[PDB]
Symmetry: C2
Subunit: 103 residues, 2 copies
Amino acid sequence: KQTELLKGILEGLVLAIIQRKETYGYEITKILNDQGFTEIVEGTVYTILLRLEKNQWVIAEKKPSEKGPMRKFYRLTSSGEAELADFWQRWTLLSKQVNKMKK
Amino acid sequence: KQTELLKGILEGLVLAIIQRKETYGYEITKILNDQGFTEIVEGTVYTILLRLEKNQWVIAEKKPSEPMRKFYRLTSSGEAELADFWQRWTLLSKQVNKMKKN
């Protein structure tokens, strides 16, 4: 259920992380891990990032790292920002509906 | 993405619903729609109930309704599942809300 529970949400959180700072898979996975979605590996993030790029919600581009090798860095498009705004609203509603069941 | 958003969650909501009342498929789909939870067709509830039976988190019995319908109660393993779901949900939304505020 924990992989299932993270479906839909993780895409939203990934968009969220990219909005805050230009970033690449390892950075994104490490932030998620520290927040702490600890059982999320970068293989899962990579898969998600492919899909985000495919739909042009994020742009991807390679720059040098600290310190040396190239890395694929991401940033939100205007459509992406729109998708993220939509995620939080949908989430805020869901979160309310589901919590109104807890008690 | 709403379909993917309900994944995991929906199963627990059904578990939670069955706990608070002994009920049937058509009705569970309705209680969910009146929540709601508008994208939920009955087939989605029927697929979940079959899986909850298979894992023995619920038991079912045929009874009359206010027509003979298939009525579900939670098992004790099912009770632990619901309880485990709330624990993890509480944690998940605490973490998700913390990232919105950031």
